[PDB]
Amino acid sequence: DSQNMTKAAQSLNSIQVALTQTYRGLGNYPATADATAASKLTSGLVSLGKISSDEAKNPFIGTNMNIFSFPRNAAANKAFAISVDGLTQAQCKTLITSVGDMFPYIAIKAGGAVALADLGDFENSAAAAETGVGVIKSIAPASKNLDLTNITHVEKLCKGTAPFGVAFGNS
């Protein structure tokens, strides 16, 4: 389908549904200062049965996807991002165009794993998809969101050296 892309889509959907159902009425998502805390958050949610072990798995690398909380219009812990790390460039581009329509926010880390600082702010970081890296889709009104009619965006998407991490966000 490819099988891993289909599985990633399913899992990413299941996780964002679980996060929004669980935490929207609680005012915030759980704090995550760094990727260590993000990893512990995912493991915690598996342990509550909110997401299954298999849904938490990054299908490309076999370990849990990190879940970060990050700011929204300066308010702490008001958005989340599910990070899919360890991708090849091809997997980065394919995944974004396969599941991206389900997420208002998308950011890319080239050459490493997603970190909190890479995420910026859910509402105030403008997308610059013509650069193919960083925030490439967001609700910021000044955003230049990924535009598959633009060959520049298509070619530059997931620019750089591997591994690639892609963060899929919502609030």
Curated annotation (Swiss-Prot):
Please give the positions of the paired cysteines in each disulfide bond.
Answer: C92-C158
Q: What does this protein do?
A: Major component of the toxin co-regulated pilus (tcp) which is a type IV pilus essential for bacterial aggregation and subsequent colonization in the host small intestine.
Which cellular component terms (GO) are annotated to the entry? extracellular organelle; membrane; pilus
Gene name, Swiss-Prot/TrEMBL = tcpA
Entry protein name: Toxin coregulated pilin
| Membrane topology, from the record | Single-pass membrane protein
UniProt keywords (A-Z) are: Disulfide bond, Fimbrium, Membrane, Methylation, Transmembrane, Transmembrane helix
Q: What is known of its domains?
A: The leader sequence region and some other sequence particularities suggest that TcpA may represent a novel class of pilin, and imply the existence of a novel signal peptidase.
Question: Where in or outside the cell?
Answer: Fimbrium; Membrane
Main localization of the protein described in the UniProt heading: other
> Span within the entire protein?
54 to 224 of 224
Coiled coil ranges: none
